[PDB]
Structure formats: structure tokens, C-alpha cells
Amino acid sequence: HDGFQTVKATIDWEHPMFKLYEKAKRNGKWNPADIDFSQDQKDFASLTSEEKISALPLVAGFSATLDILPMAHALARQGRLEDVLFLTTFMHDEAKHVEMFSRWQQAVGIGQMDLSVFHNDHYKRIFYEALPEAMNRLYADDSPEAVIRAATVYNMIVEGTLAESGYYTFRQIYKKAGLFPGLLQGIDYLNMDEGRHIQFGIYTIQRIVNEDERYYELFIRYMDELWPHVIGYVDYLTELGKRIDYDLLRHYVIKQFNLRKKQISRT
Amino acid sequence: QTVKATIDWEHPMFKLYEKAKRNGKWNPADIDFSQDQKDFASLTSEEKISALPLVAGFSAGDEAVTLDILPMAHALARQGRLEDVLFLTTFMHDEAKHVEMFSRWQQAVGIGQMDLSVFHNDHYKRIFYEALPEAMNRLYADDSPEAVIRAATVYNMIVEGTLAESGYYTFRQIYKKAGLFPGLLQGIDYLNMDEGRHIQFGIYTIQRIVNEDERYYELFIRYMDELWPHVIGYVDYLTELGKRQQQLARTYALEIDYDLLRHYVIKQFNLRKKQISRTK
Ligand SMILES: CCCCCCCCCCCCCCCC(=O)O
Ligand SMILES: CCCCCCCCCCCCCCCC(=O)O
Ligand SMILES: [Fe+2]
Ligand SMILES: [Fe+2]
Ligand SMILES: [Fe+2]
Ligand SMILES: [Fe+2]
Ligand SMILES: [Mn+2]
Ligand SMILES: [Mn+2]
Numbered sequence: 023h024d025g026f027q028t029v030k031a032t033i034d035w036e037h038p039m040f041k042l043y044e045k046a047k048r049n050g051k052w053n054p055a056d057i058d059f060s061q062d063q064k065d066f067a068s069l070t071s072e073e074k075i076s077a078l079p080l081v082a083g084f085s086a087t088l089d090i091l092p093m094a095h096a097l098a099r100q101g102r103l104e105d106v107l108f109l110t111t112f113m114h115d116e117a118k119h120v121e122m123f124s125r126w127q128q129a130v131g132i133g134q135m136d137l138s139v140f141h142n143d144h145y146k147r148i149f150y151e152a153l154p155e156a157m158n159r160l161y162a163d164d165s166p167e168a169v170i171r172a173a174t175v176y177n178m179i180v181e182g183t184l185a186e187s188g189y190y191t192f193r194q195i196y197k198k199a200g201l202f203p204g205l206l207q208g209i210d211y212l213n214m215d216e217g218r219h220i221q222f223g224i225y226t227i228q229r230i231v232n233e234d235e236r237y238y239e240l241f242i243r244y245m246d247e248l249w250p251h252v253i254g255y256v257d258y259l260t261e262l263g264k265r266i267d268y269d270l271l272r273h274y275v276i277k278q279f280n281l282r283k284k285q286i287s288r289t
Numbered sequence: 290q291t292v293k294a295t296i297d298w299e300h301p302m303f304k305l306y307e308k309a310k311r312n313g314k315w316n317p318a319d320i321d322f323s324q325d326q327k328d329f330a331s332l333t334s335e336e337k338i339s340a341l342p343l344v345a346g347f348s349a350g351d352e353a354v355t356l357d358i359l360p361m362a363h364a365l366a367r368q369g370r371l372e373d374v375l376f377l378t379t380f381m382h383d384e385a386k387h388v389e390m391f392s393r394w395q396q397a398v399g400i401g402q403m404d405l406s407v408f409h410n411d412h413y414k415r416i417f418y419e420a421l422p423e424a425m426n427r428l429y430a431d432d433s434p435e436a437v438i439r440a441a442t443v444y445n446m447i448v449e450g451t452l453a454e455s456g457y458y459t460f461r462q463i464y465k466k467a468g469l470f471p472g473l474l475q476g477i478d479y480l481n482m483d484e485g486r487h488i489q490f491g492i493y494t495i496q497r498i499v500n501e502d503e504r505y506y507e508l509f510i511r512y513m514d515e516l517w518p519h520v521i522g523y524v525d526y527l528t529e530l531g532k533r534q535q536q537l538a539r540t541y542a543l544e545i546d547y548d549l550l551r552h553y554v555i556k557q558f559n560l561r562k563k564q565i566s567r568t569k
Pocket of ligand 7: 115116119212216
């Protein structure tokens with residue numbers, strides 16, 4: 023350490039990531055331990071076994087360990103105190119996301135099911151390969167390019183495209199049916215958390231584009247490199263369920279993906 | 290069915306995570322600092338500096354540990370200790386709020402542009418600028434029992450368990466007694482509660498490692514004593530600063546017993562050693 027900002031100066035109170043950190047503290051007090059899951063257990067019990075099986079592929083998607091931590095290292099190493107302050111709320115959010123799904127699986131009795139079997143090739147290419155490789159790269163390579171790639175795979179694709187669509191899917195299937203109210207309450211808290219996360223992704227990608235516009239084009243190319251595995255995983259889930267409007271859900275994915283591109287401007 | 294569950298609900302560090310969530314909802318943005326600002330204004334310029342060395346110690350220290358906890362969370366996730374990692378997210382968020390609280394107090398009392406670094410002497414720099422980050426960053430390449438005990442000893446048992454605990458006692462002994470800085474002390478009391486969980490994580494980490502090989506207990510003691518000369522060396526310098534700017538003690542009829550505080554620092558240090566046993 024050469025020195026410390028809160029000794030020489032203050033926190034940059036006007037920094038957008040400090041203002042995002044404040045929002046996270048106000049809006050992130052929810053606790054998975056407070057959610058009533060007893061109705062969810064009775065709803066899963068009340069399902070024929072045909073209906074129990076059809077829910078597992080989508081739930082299997084969410085069963086995927088502080089994925090953002092290397093970004094917190096890289097940005098701390100650069101002296102971005104406000105970002106680090108925000109990223110402590112990002113990490114705690116993700117601990118609560120693992121907690122909520124774990125508790126819900128326990129309540130409905132599938133926490134010991136090996137849900138891995140519903141991860142096809144395209145899923146694994148995103149969650150087993152591109153996400154951890156892009157984030158871990160940042161411990162050795164913190165370049166403008168490496169940071170945009172990390173934020174694209176994780177914040178714009180994994181959170182901003184796939185998770186968003188999964189949450190919308192959960193409301194479209196179960197909220198309408200009046201099923202699984204504890205799960206849906208959890209989903210709504212996760213969806214609010216993930217909004218701040220996507221905003222950190224957008225801000226990170228953009229303060230870089232405000233440097234050099236060549237990177238805006240890296241952003242699009244990286245977004246486009248991953249698209250075949252987003253839609254390839256979506257199609258596999260579509261196929262399994264048909265064996266609930268699957269064509270408006272595939273359209274929501276496409277909608278979300280192009281909407282992520284539009285939140286980064288060239289100027 | 291057929292696989293192990295994701296989370297061990299009974300693990301001691303999951304229990305600690307659940308308490309951090311329940312007990313850790315305070316927000317520095319809620320603290321009323323308007324009486325502090327009025328208290329600081331009314332001080333003579335001699336009285337406006339007797340508190341600043343300690344604030345300097347805490348602002349930097351809280352900043353340092355916010356940056357420097359990240360390797361421990363890396364190492365423990367790599368060892369598959371999911372429940373520890375869940376707990377360490379509350380630990381990390383706690384420390385960001387501690388840095389926030391101190392910066393807000395500096396900002397509110399009008400000293401936001403003042404460079405408080407000058408109150409970091411040589412021994413302060415050797416712990417917070419130097420030994421803390423080195424021990425923690427080591428865990429990126431070397432996550433052995435030995436490296437983990439050293440990190441948890443410098444961070445939890447010395448920095449939190451000795452220096453910070455003693456700093457909080459100092460604050461209550463001088464400013465709570467005088468009725469100064471009511472917002473700062475409200476923060477102090479919040480920080481003190483959080484830090485109980487942080488020391489407990491250090492105790493549990495250090496102990497689970499000693500329970501495997503007893504040779505590590507002795508490493509622990511040696512690391513504790515290696516750090517002591519810079520602990521007491523920083524404490525002696527702050528003592529020297531207070532004895533020389535006695536105007537705020539005079540004004541508020543405070544008998545500041547610098548030897549009582551020095552004994553508290555010695556107590557805390559011997560007490561952190563005692564909370565680790567050779568056997569178990
Ligand atoms: C069954 C209908 C299929 C159509 C909708 C497909 C979208 C589902 C996406 C589920 C994957 C979400 C993965 C969680 C990401 C994370 O770890 O934050
Ligand atoms: C005159 C007696 C001096 C007593 C010692 C005072 C110590 C000052 C505080 C500096 C340490 C702060 C470390 C922060 C710990 C954390 O944020 O986890
Ligand atoms: Fe997220
Ligand atoms: Fe395919
Ligand atoms: Fe602490
Ligand atoms: Fe000395
Ligand atoms: Mn999440
Ligand atoms: Mn602290």
C-alpha cells in the first residue's frame with residue numbers, strides 16, 4: 023500500500039458505484055431465512071410425478087461460487103475504492119442466491135437430486151467454461167479487453183440474458199398457476215438484486231467505451247460469440263418441456279440479448 | 290435420493306453467516322453526524338487534533354482490510370468451504386461499511402481535505418501498509434495451513450482482536466466520557482458488534498488448523514509475538530501524542546489514564562493467544 027484515500031481525502035461520494043452501493047444497502051436487506059416455504063412443499067407434493075419432472079430442467083439451470091470475486095480483486099488493485107464497496111454487496115447477494123435455492127430445494131425435497139443431468143453441451147460451454155475462464159483471467163490479465171469480456175459473459179449474458187429470462191419464465195409458469203409462492207418471493211428479490219449487478223456490468227463496459235470506441239466493437243463481438251450457446255441451451259429446455267408458451271419465452275431471450283447490446287452506447 | 294446437499298445448515302460458519310445477516314443491518318448513511326459537526330467546530334485548534342490520530346488509524350486500517358480480505362475468500366472457496374465463503378461475504382461487506390462510516394465522520398466535521406497520513410508512524414506502516422497485505426496476498430499462491438494461520442493471526446487476532454478492540458475502548462474512555470462525537474460513537478458501537486463476528490471467524494479458522502497438527506499452535510504464538518513490537522510501538526507513539534496535546538482533556542475535566550489503555554492493549558493481546566488451545 024502506497025496510501026489510503028479515506029485518510030488523504032474522502033470516499034468519492036458522487037461516484038456512480040458509490041451511489042449504486044447505497045441503493046444496494048437500502049434494497050438488499052432481504053433474508054432467505056425469512057421466507058415461508060411451507061406452501062411450496064405442499065405444492066411440490068401435490069404434483070403428479072409427470073409435473074414434478076417437468077420443473078427440474080429450469081431449476082437445474084439455477085443450481086449454477088463468488089463468480090465476481092476476481093473482478094473485485096482486479097478493481098481493488100486499480101484503486102477503485104467505490105467499485106469495491108459496491109462489489110461487497112454483489113458478493114453478498116450471490117451468497118443469498120445460493121442460499122435461497124438451497125433452502126427451496128430442501129423444502130421441496132430435491133436438494134439431494136443430481137440436477138446436473140439437465141446441463142447439456144451449450145449450458146456447460148457457458149457456465150463450466152466461458153464464465154470461470156473469463157473471470158479468473160482477471161487475476162493475471164486486467165486489461166481493458168479482459169474486463170469487458172468478464173462483464174459481458176457474467177453481467178450481460180449470464181445475469182442480463184439467461185437469469186432474467188429464467189426469472190420471467192418462473193413467473194410466467196408458476197405465478198399464473200398460483201404455485202410455489204416462497205420460490206416466487208425469492209425470485210423477485212433475486213431479480214431486484216440482479217438489476218444492480220447488470221448496472222455494474224453496463225457501467226464497467228461503458229467507462230471503457232468512453233475511453234476508446236474500438237472496444238464497443240469487442241463488446242458486440244463477444245456478445246455475439248456466446249449467442250449460439252444461449253439459444254442452444256434455450257432450445258434444449260424447450261424440447262424437454264414440450265415432451266406454458268415456449269415460443270414467447272424464446273422471444274424474451276432474444277429480446278433480453280439485444281436489449282443488453284443497446285445499453286452500451288458508442289458515444 | 291443420490292447426491293450430497295449444497296449447504297451444511299449446521300456448520301459453525303453457516304450459523305455465523307445467519308447471525309451476521311440478522312445483526313448486521315446497520316447503515317452508516319443513517320447516522321446523525323450533525324451534533325458531531327457542532328462538537329468539532331467548538332473545539333480550539335489544539336483540541337481539534339487530539340482525536341485525529343486515532344481516526345487516522347481507523348480510516349486507513351478499515352480501508353486496508355476492505356482491500357485485503359479478498360484472498361482469504363479466494364483460498365477458502367478453492368478448498369470447497371462453501372459455508373465459510375458465505376460468512377466471508379458478510380465480513381467483507383461489514384468492512385466496507387466501516388470505511389464508509391469513518392469517511393462520513395471526517396466529511397461531516399469539515400476535515401475531509403486534511404491529510405491524516407502523517408499520524409501513521411513507522412510501526413503503523415509495518416503492519417497495515419506492509420505485513421497485512423503480504424500475508425493475505427500470499428494465499429493466492431500458498432494456501433497451506435501455515436499461510437492461513439499467519440493471515441488470520443495478522444488480520445483477525447492482531448489487527449481486529451488487539452488494535453481495533455483497544456481503539457474502540459480508547460474511544461469510549463475519552464470521548465464517550467466527555468460527551469463528544471455522539472454519531473462517531475454510535476458507529477463505534479456498530480463496528481464493535483460486527484468485529485465480534487470477525488474475531489470469532491479468526492478463532493475458528495486458527496483452531497480448526499491447530500486441531501489437526503499441534504505444531505501449528507506454536508507457529509501461532511511465534512507470529513503473535515513477532516507482531517507485538519509494532520503493536521506496542523504504534524501504541525506508544527499515540528500515547529506520546531496524547532500526553533503532548535492535553536488541552537481537550539483539560540477542557541472536559543478528563544483524567545486520561547494512558548497507562549490503563551496501555552494495559553488494555555496488553556490484556557487484549559494475551560487474551561487473543563488464550564482463545565487458541567494447543568489441543569482439541
Ligand atoms: C422451460 C422454458 C424454456 C424457455 C426459457 C429459458 C430461460 C431459462 C434460463 C435458466 C438459466 C439461468 C442460470 C442462472 C444464472 C446465475 O447463476 O445467475
Ligand atoms: C493510546 C492507546 C492506543 C490503542 C490502539 C489504538 C488503535 C487504533 C486503531 C487502528 C486499527 C484499526 C484496524 C481496523 C480493523 C477492521 O476494520 O477490521
Ligand atoms: Fe447476479
Ligand atoms: Fe447444439
Ligand atoms: Fe473487522
Ligand atoms: Fe520505534
Ligand atoms: Mn445471482
Ligand atoms: Mn472494520
